[PDB]
Design a protein around this nucleic acid. Structure first.
Ligand SMILES: CC[C@H](O)[C@@H](C)[C@H]1O[C@@H]1C[C@@](C)(O)/C=C/C=C(\C)[C@H]1OC(=O)C[C@H](O)CC[C@@](C)(O)[C@@H](OC(=O)N2CCN(C3CCCCCC3)CC2)/C=C/[C@@H]1C
Ligand SMILES: [Zn+2]
Ligand SMILES: [Zn+2]
Ligand SMILES: [Zn+2]
Lengths: 66, 200, 289, 160, 85, 182
RNA sequence: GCCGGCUAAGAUCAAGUGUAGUAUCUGUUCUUAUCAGUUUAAUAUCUGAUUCCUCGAGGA
């Protein structure tokens, strides 16, 4: 429960999906050749891709329900 | 008729200063010794002369036959400090299920570990009632003992006559009987006052 | 020297015991052909009780000397005697017998111990099969990497024990699965381990604490030996079940899988489509250079 | 029932995969069924072979008819005198033609069938015109060599 | 009340007593000790300086994780000292 | 304010994975979608039962343990070790998604024994010895169910026939694996 | 288990015995009934309401 990203019987789809999006972005920031792949694919500098991922970290999957 | 399935072993020759405990240690080194179901005292016999004199022969029955064949190939022709023993399948010439199953359960492989039995009763008496009545405390102790005897075997029972809350301790042999006594004593009335019970 | 030496093994001083055991070990290692095998058998059966010593040096020397004596006189007779002793004794002596069987199987290759041990599981009587299962558990835990050649031989026995109604059978089979999984890792034994997971998994709905503890241990061993992708594949359909019991069990298993190897799970998550309100597709992984 | 062929006259050497292996050359036999007895726990000589198409079952019934399999008259079919141990390859018209040589038959004969398969039970009942044909069947046909099956003709009811 | 401490572990080495000398602190195994145990600073202070991590008696030798616990990275949690409340 | 089974079956791409209780979930659309992932074995099926996962029927009474063939064929030297590692075979194994449950334990060529019991002689060198089912095939014609089957005498020559092989199916690359030990 | 059923398919409430732990046994009862609320994946559970026939009695 103290670890961030764990769930329980009341976990919703939104929390699950934002958790996997957030650690996906962190894994992209960590691994050197995944960021290379993305920066070649979208034709940007690697610093720009890193900053874009950090900016996307705040609200991935949009704002929550109700 | 029973050719094999003989769990009795015959120890030919022994030191004439043999005690029963050294012998049952010698025999327990090779497995579990069957115990007489009605009683204690493992089924071990020291054959004796017309007097206290020790003939030097011994009988021992085992729970299983594999322990007999163990004693056959490990005790035969082996020396205790002074003498040379001889081991042979015993010769004979001329309640039940309960304890049988218990001795069997002595070979279990059940899970161990786990957590690894005293009930405290309060608000039962007062020190002010025992100042002008020397026989009320003994009658209250006898009533508490008669109440604790119905739930299980009470091993120790004490009553604090100098405690202002009326503390009493009942220590039984099993924690289930103490839990049953704490469940049957909680909320009950004793002497016009509501007494409480807790575990220890 | 040796028949004069064997009564000193029962002395109760620690230095005397350690030095006597070391001396008997050296003698058995180099001068094994000078004393009969019957006396060696008696000495090993006496050493059996020293595996319970409160001191670590006594246990270390006893393990060494037992290995030497077993290497000397041969595995067959000592293994027969150890199985007989495992059948008839109290708990601590049976545990020491299990340790001794594992030692014999490590010094003399487990090929020499496994057939006789599996032949004892054929006895139609409980408390004998459970002893065989405990011995197999400790054997695999003790031999570790050497077990990669013997997983195919014990798989049907573990199947049988996992289909059994007895609870100790399934708990001990789960312990065996865990030790076997952590023993072979990086050696390409995933087929048998997936096969055995197919029999371990139905026990997740068990209320008995010891059984569920052993099942969790086996699952965390298979997480290492088999990989987190398979575990996530086993958890996906239960993560959002309508019943709260299924959800509790599956989220416990999932949290255990998530705390270890959080990074690998990035490559294993299934695709989840966008709804009207929220975006769920990870688009970067769809790029194609 | 149309795609399945009922086989009768199987000995102890024939088994459940053996009939499917023998019927594999005739057609694609998908399954084989052998009903086990309650007292003996073995096959009663009659079984079924369910194929894929009805033409394969017709070819198996027209090819494996009155064959000598395991020393037994195996035959495939579409799934007061008493005759016992009769071959399942014969029909009611064949039994009426075989019984016409001894005496005259009053009507068409009937053969008993099993309640599960319905091909052949093992016994049959036939009625003659007079007692002379029954005596000729009990003298000559009671013990005659049939198609790899020793039949036995007896009287169904007799008054002392 | 057998609960691990689970605080940030420091530079202090865990100790075992004469009774627990060969044991693993987490799973209680005796086979293949692999990784040296580290404890936090509140477990290593003053009278607590040298003490068994399993029971709390006078330490005599180093505490170790087993190879099985090291493979599963169970040496990466906090202080493994058994603390009672 | 909850779907019905038929209503939810109309929304999902795969309706045959929908079940009775699936409409009672907190998020049935995600549940049904995960039930359709191209993997992910389902739940052990006895969660809703009331018999503690061990069925007390089906006659579980049976032999204790059948050792493998390699088990049967000092105690044995390195030569019998050689035997145990030459005879060692891989047993039957189930693939990734085949969970166990209480019930799933019970549910032109002729053999020499059947040919010896049927009274058929062995194949000669150069002669015609057909089975008694081959005369009907020679009279009526070839079977339409297996047109590629060959029989000696009709389609196959007499000198073919060898041992117990009385028929052969004649149906009308670089298959070597790449990296393998020599 | 035997040839759909013979009430060994489940829950529960009191007491006894006993273990480190799991447990084991006896009396029971089992709503034969309806509605509303709680709750359960659904049951379950709990929380409340609800003259006639026969031979002085019994049943509904
Ligand atoms: C179910 C088993 C029981 O829990 C049992 C181990 C234990 O619980 C009982 C209590 C007691 C006191 O009777 C016994 C305890 C422990 C033992 C007998 C172990 O020995 C010791 O304590 C002495 C010391 O810790 C080291 C012993 C040692 C090196 O043999 C240890 O095993 C090993 O380290 N191994 C075994 C594996 N072996 C191979 C060889 C290749 C490379 C190294 C790893 C794999 C290397 C050496 C365990 C032995 C006894 C189980
Ligand atoms: Zn460990
Ligand atoms: Zn300690
Ligand atoms: Zn700490």
């Amino acid at each position: 429960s103290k670890y961030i990203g764990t769930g329980h019987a009341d976990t919703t789809k939104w929390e699950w999906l934002v958790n996997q999006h957030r650690d996906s972005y962190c894994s992209y920031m960590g691994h050197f050749d995944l960021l290379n792949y993305f920066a070649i694919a979208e034709n940007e500098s690697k610093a720009r891709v890193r900053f874009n991922l950090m900016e996307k970290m705040l609200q991935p999957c949009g704002p929550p329900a109700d | 008729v029973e050719e094999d399935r003989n769990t009795n072993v015959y120890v030919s020759g022994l030191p004439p200063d043999i005690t029963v405990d050294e012998f049952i240690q010698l025999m327990s080194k090779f497995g579990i010794i069957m115990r007489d179901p009605q009683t204690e005292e493992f089924k071990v016999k020291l054959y004796k002369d017309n007097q206290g004199n020790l003939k030097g022969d011994g009988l021992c029955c085992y729970l299983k036959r594999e322990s007999v064949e163990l004693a056959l190939k490990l005790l035969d022709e082996d020396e205790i400090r002074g003498y040379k023993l001889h081991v042979e399948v015993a010769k004979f010439q001329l309640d039940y299920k309960k304890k049988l199953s218990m001795q069997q359960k002595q070979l279990d492989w059940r899970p161990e570990r786990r957590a690894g039995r005293v009930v405290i009763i309060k608000n039962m008496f007062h020190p002010m009632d025992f100042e002008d009545d020397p026989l009320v405390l003994n009658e209250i102790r006898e009533d508490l003992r008669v109440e604790c005897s119905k739930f299980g075997q009470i091993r120790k029972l004490l009553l604090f006559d100098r405690h202002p809350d009326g503390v009493a301790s009942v220590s039984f042999r099993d924690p289930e009987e103490a839990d049953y006594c704490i469940q049957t004593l909680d909320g009950r009335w004793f002497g016009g006052r509501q007494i409480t019970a807790q575990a220890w | 020297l040796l028949p004069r030496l064997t009564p000193i093994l029962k002395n109760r001083h620690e230095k005397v015991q350690e030095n006597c055991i070391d001396l008997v070990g050296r003698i058995a290692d180099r001068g094994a052909e000078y004393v009969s095998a019957r006396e060696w058998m008696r000495i090993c059966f006496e050493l059996l009780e020293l595996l319970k010593a409160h001191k670590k040096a006594i246990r270390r020397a006893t393990v060494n000397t037992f290995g030497y004596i077993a290497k000397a006189i041969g595995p067959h007779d000592v293994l027969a005697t150890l199985l007989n002793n495992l059948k008839v004794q109290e708990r601590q002596n049976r545990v020491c017998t299990t340790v001794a069987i594992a030692i014999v199987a490590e010094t003399c290759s487990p090929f020499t111990v496994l057939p006789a041990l599996m032949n004892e599981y054929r006895v139609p009587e409980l408390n004998v099969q459970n002893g065989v299962l405990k011995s197999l558990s400790f054997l695999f835990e003790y031999i570790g990497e050497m077990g990669k050649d013997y997983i195919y031989a014990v798989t049907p026995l573990l199947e049988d024990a996992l289909m059994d109604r007895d609870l100790v059978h399934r708990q001990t089979a789960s312990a065996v699965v865990q030790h076997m999984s952590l023993g072979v890792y990086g050696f390409g034994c995933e087929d048998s381990l997936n096969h055995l997971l197919n029999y371990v998994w139905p026990n997740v709905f068990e209320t008995s604490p010891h059984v569920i503890q052993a099942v969790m241990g086996a699952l965390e061993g298979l997480r290492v030996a088999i990989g987190p992708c398979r575990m996530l594949q086993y958890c996906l359909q239960g993560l959002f079940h309508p019943a709260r019991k299924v959800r509790d069990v599956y989220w416990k298993i999932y949290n255990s899988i998530y705390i270890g190897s959080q990074d690998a799970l990035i490559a294993h998550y299934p695709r989840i489509y966008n709804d009207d309100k929220n975006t769920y597709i990870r688009y970067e992984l769809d790029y194609i250079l | 029932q149309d795609a399945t062929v009922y086989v009768g006259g199987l000995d102890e050497k024939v088994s459940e995969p053996l009939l499917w292996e023998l019927f594999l050359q005739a057609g694609p036999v998908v399954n084989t069924h052998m009903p086990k007895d309650r007292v003996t726990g073995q096959h009663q000589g009659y079984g079924f072979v369910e194929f894929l198409s009805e033409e394969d079952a017709d070819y198996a019934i027209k090819i494996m008819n009155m064959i000598k399999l395991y020393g037994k008259p195996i035959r495939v079919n579409k799934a007061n005198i008493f005759i016992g141990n009769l071959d399942p390859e014969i029909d009611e018209k064949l039994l009426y033609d075989t019984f016409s040589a001894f005496g005259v038959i009053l009507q068409t004969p009937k053969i008993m069938r099993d309640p599960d398969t319905g091909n052949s039970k093992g016994y049959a009942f036939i009625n003659f015109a007079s007692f002379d044909a029954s005596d000729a069947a009990i003298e000559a046909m009671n013990g005659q060599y049939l198609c790899n099956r020793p039949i036995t003709v007896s009287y169904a009811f007799k008054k002392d | 009340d057998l609960i691990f401490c689970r605080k940030q572990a420091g530079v202090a080495i865990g100790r075992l007593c004469e009774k627990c000398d060969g044991k693993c602190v987490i799973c209680d195994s005796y086979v293949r000790p692999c990784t040296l145990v580290r404890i936090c600073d509140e477990c290593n202070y003053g009278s607590y300086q040298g003490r068994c991590v399993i029971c709390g008696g006078p330490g005599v030798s180093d505490a170790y994780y087993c190879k099985e616990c090291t493979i599963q990275e169970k040496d990466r949690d906090g202080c493994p000292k058994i603390v009672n409340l | 304010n909850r779907f019905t089974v038929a209503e939810l079956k109309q929304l999902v791409a795969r309706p045959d994975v929908v079940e009775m209780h699936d409409v009672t979930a907190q998020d049935p659309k995600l549940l049904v979608h995960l039930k359709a992932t191209r993997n992910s074995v389902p739940v052990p099926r006895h969660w809703c039962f009331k018999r503690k996962y061990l069925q007390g029927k089906r006659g579980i009474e049976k032999p204790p343990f059948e050792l493998p063939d390699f088990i049967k064929r000092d105690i044995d030297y390195q030569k019998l070790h050689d035997a145990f590692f030459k005879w060692q075979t891989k047993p039957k194994l189930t693939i990734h998604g085949d969970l166990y449950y209480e019930g799933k334990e019970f549910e032109g060529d002729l053999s020499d024994e059947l040919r010896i019991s049927l009274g058929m002689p062995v194949g000669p060198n150069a002669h015609k010895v057909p089975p008694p089912w081959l005369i009907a095939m020679q009279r009526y014609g070839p079977p339409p169910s297996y047109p590629n089957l060959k029989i000696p005498g009709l389609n196959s020559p007499i000198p073919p026939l060898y041992g117990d092989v009385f028929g052969t199916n004649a149906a009308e690359i670089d298959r070597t694996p790449w990296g393998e030990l020599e």
